[PDB]
Amino acid sequence: ENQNVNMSRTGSILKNQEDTFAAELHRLKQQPLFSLVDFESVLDRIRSTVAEHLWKLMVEESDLLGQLKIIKDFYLLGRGELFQAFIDVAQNMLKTPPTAVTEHDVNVAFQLSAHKVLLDDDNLLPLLNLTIREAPTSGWAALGLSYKVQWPLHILFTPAVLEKYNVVFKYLLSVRRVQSELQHCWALQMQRKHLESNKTDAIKWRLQNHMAFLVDNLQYYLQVDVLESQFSQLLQQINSTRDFESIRLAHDHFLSNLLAQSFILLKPVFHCLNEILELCHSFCSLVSQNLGPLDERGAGQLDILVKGFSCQSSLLFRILSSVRNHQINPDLAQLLLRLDYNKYY
Amino acid sequence: RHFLLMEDGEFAQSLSDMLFEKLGSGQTPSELLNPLVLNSILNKALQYSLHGDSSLASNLTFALKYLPEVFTPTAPDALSCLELKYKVDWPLNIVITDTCMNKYSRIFSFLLQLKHMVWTLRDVWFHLKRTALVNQASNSVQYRQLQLYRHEMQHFVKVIQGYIANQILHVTWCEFRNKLSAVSNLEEIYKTHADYLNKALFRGLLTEKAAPLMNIIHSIFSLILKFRLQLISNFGLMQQSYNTFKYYSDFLFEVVSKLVNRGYQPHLEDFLLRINFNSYY
Amino acid sequence: PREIITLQLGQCGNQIGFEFWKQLCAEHGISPEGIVEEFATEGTDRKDVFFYQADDEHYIPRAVLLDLEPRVIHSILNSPYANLYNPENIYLSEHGGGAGNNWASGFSQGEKIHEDIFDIIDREADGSDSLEGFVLCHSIAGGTGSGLGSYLLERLNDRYPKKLVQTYSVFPNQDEMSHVVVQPYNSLLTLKRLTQNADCVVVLDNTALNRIATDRLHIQNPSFSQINQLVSTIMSASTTTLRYPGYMNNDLIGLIASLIPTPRLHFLMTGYTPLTTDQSVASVRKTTVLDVMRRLLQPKNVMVSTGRDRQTNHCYIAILNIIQGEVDPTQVHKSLQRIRERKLANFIPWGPASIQVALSRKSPYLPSAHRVSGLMMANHTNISSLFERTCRQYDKLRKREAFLEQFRKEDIFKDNFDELDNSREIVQQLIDEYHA
Amino acid sequence: PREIITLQLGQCGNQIGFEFWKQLCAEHGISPEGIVEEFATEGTDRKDVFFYQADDEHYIPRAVLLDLEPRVIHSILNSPYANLYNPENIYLSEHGGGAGNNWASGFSQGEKIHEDIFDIIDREADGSDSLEGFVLCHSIAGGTGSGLGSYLLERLNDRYPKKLVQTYSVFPNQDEMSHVVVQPYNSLLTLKRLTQNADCVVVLDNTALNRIATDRLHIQNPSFSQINQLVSTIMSASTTTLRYPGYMNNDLIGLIASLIPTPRLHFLMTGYTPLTTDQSVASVRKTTVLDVMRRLLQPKNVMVSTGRDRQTNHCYIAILNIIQGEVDPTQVHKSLQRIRERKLANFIPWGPASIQVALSRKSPYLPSAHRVSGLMMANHTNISSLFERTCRQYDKLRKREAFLEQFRKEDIFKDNFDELDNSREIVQQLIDEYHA
């Protein structure tokens, strides 16, 4: 009734649902008694023909299939390269405690980053801005995204559940950064001219073959299997169902499955997983010195890290005993063992 | 757009010739023939640029206001006291109101003082123009570092005015006609046209019509007269005057850092362009 | 109002100005002998700024063309664009000249035809009561354009002192020295007059022409018929704020005032990317302005032979980036947003720099209202590499006893060779001193 | 962004890179001289990662091709795919070289053309402000690709220290030693530079080529026209995460980082099954992903001559299994389920192993969007059998007094033969020591 009267769900200015509804009304009125089946079988008819006409509304006005793969590509990060150039530039100027002007600065940086890439749609670029806390210690793991939404697609995206998409969004870019930071401190020791032939390098080196093999496995078999056959049933449901809330709460079961696989356990595993990405983050800042493995501080800082890396594989070992002795969760167990025979074999 | 926003700049270039007829205030007559020959020469200036018919030329009128410039008697200016008046006619009255013509006088007087800066700043290049005039290409007493601070002065002004010109004109002309027409929402036009004009003064400087940024565009205007009087006429009194400009330009930079808030004022980023330019050198 | 008189002079200066006037009729929607299209006044809002003002809607060019060689003008009258030119403003039929190949020929011929050379070119001066200035569309190559062009840079400096002088001069070719050998002598004699007897120049290198003429143009035998195609477009590109209706720096004394740091530092680097006709099939998809100025500061479109490893100790001071036609001006401030993040221009550490961008609507024509065009007018302090190239080829030739006995028989009695050498080193020393 | 400069070099390295660029236009939906299909942007989401970025929608290849022999480049310009190549990036027409067949020829020619070899290949480096690295698409066979390729592995290690180096180098043929006899000398000199002066290699054996070229391809006379068909597909197969839009290990420093255990252990075994065109008539019935990786670890598609009974005491450490195009990803975890039950890969007893599987959508083309493709990048410690084969053919030749007087006349004064022998045995001893 707000925007436009020919856009009605039942068919009220534009269709003739109303005369049929009035005939149903005369039939319902003609009854002195009351029961359950006669009242509720025609609660279908005031719902089902109404639940299909708005499905035939929003297909044509919006190109439905357009933005509802676009909004997932901003949050679940389908365009993976197109944000790493943002992450590389936003790292070099989030090296402060956050202030209120850094929101606008990181924003215009994501602007120029997505602009030099040549997106296939120039107006898809300024459809969002980015948002970031007050000043905890650092700008990373405190930033977010605002992708606001137009007419009636917003009834599918309440302002609650974009926080539910944004909260894993800062988590998935955090494992793009620590994957790429482990990809760059690896990239310093590629040649023999930067390599020392000491045994202090060899004890540095079995660790990254254990730790850089993790985030290229743990955050891959999570993130790719989260996307593929959860995107698969959405596209198969909207191509096979002419109904509104059954499509709608099926994408509510979609989002709650993504935020359950990516959460694996509340206190321990999320504390085990962020302890993994902290402990290989100091493997970046240890290697990043000039001629690392020949320094006394290069081996002195290392000795704490050779404890903390097996503090993480053995804590990963502690969850696997809770996965075998199993009354908790099957999707937890199928994923964590999939990386584990990809670990122990 | 052609005679208030000045995007066919032949009229505002001819305004510079009208700014080349004042040259300081007040030394102009106070007769009643002073509006009589001065309202004419602006109508004659449109035929001097060979553009437009007389159909829209009835929509332009000029009202010479009266303000003291010797400051006890009157001798009114044409750098900031010459105003174009747009007309209200018989069918077109839902487009033009009295509030929007009040700010047309504000916009026309604000271009007319920045154009007086840029024009008289190039009048000094006419003073030292080559036969030779001023001489001593580098030595004797300074021209090498003299013209070095004068051109980095005329650097900063000529690139400020170009950036203020790009934020006034372009997106406002992109927002205006197209949007209004396509929205087939055309009833009670002055509730939308005045909002368009309120954005058009939002984009200029807007200063909430009260901020001290208007006091700095006056002080940097106050040295350009000091710049032009020393070149018409002193070399030690020169080098102090532009250190005062470099103090006032750095004063203009530090207030911008206080307007900073976030995500706001598309001139503020454009000012922070030059600040991050000022950091790398 | 803003009338400029072009001074087309020499063997190469007459041909680069011949297609410059031929370019102007295709964009004004006019014919050289008639007016068949109505697009000249509704589409173009100003036409009487380089042409003479009309008497029968026939926009006469404000041009003069003198040369010692009659070969350049005999290839003009058979072309159908010569009826727009007048046979009474410059010369009538059968005009001639010298023999003739010498810098001292045209330098001595200026004061024997002194009565006639200051008679018919001054008739166009008092046509407008507010003259803009003079552009010397002359050449440096050969002795024809360099010999007589040095004379008018002196006598027009005091007879017309309040007028702008600025030239679009072409630099000669330094590949081999067999056909011409007098190239270091006549070039440096005019280059002294271009700094103290002239305010500004626009440099146009010849060794950088065939760098572009085989880049995207794909020729096998380099001819002289390609030298007029790169030159005539950027000439009309430089007056797009002046010919077409613009607002800021819409005069020739507007553009040059915002780029010159100081006298004897006026050598402006030029750049122009779009020269390919098969780009037209993919500009239909809204090719933006965000990608056209990322390649201007990148040394690819430059017309100046300079060092590639000498840009770290040199700093840009003034850079112009002119977009034309369809601009989409809601993202032109977005293009200038990305400039500070790369810092592709080294900035001077003593003072501020400036990246000036401007726009003007192009001609109502299909190859003009569809494809984005970018004109660059840079000013970088690596231009002394050409001055080090010309000076090292100048002092090496004087130790080989070359043209010291063959050049001082006519009108040269004293050694004016070191008068050009010190003044060239004054330019080369004040450039490096300019960044303190 | 992620721009890689390919260094095509030698008699065999230029031909394997010629059809590598020719393969890329058929999958990008583009023509080497024009753009006739709209499938390039809607189907392919990223194209400027190996090509140079467009100026007229003409994706220039970022390629350089130097060789002493002019025969490999004279079979290029008559082909219609050479107009995509530029005649100013590498050489103009009529480029030549040496006489010439020596390892010491190109090793001594690197410092006499030292000014020109570091001038035009560095112009493509500063085109992107974040360079990925350098791939040396060179050869080991002959003295042309092995002589000059050892020089650039040294001087690009310090001038560009923060860049990835990794090569797709082809191994020579060891069947008879009649036409060439200098094969043990020039191979081991480059193999030392491939371990300490280079991070990673991709080995490509020649005796394993004709094992596959008569397996399913059914030829009677082995020609050189078949060597470009197995090589150009797996080159474009290795960049499917990099060219086509992928998520994890979508860079060249992503893939190589997850497979190298340690420096001087980087020799990766390659496998690629589908090469037959009559398989196409039975892939219409949903041929799955559950059967395509059971044959990758089975030694049938390998391109490395290794022992069959030496795999029990050797252990896999890193194995890559790349599926492309139609994957049916609801059973790709089902394919990795069956890996632990067979244990076809022997696992290292000191540490964990990894079977990494990844996918990316292929080109919008009918032979590409229908048939399953499997690319293998293995790393097995039986690769010392080739190093035992090359070393046993190296010390046997030095006892026969072969090329000790014919090789040390030019630029060799000391015996650097045991400098290659001990460093090769250092690789062979640290491989067997690596599984404790």
Curated annotation (Swiss-Prot), chains C, D:
Its main location: cytoplasm. SUPFAM superfamilies: Tubulin C-terminal domain-like, Tubulin nucleotide-binding domain-like. It comes from the Eukaryota. GO terms for cellular component: centrosome; cytoplasm; gamma-tubulin complex; gamma-tubulin ring complex; mitotic spindle microtubule; nucleus; polar microtubule; spindle. GO terms for biological process: cytoplasmic microtubule organization; meiotic spindle organization; microtubule nucleation; mitotic cell cycle; mitotic sister chromatid segregation; mitotic spindle organization. GTP binds at residues 141-147. Keywords: Cytoplasm, Cytoskeleton, GTP-binding, Microtubule, Nucleotide-binding. The keyword Metal-binding does not apply. This is Tubulin gamma-1 chain. It comes from Xenopus laevis.
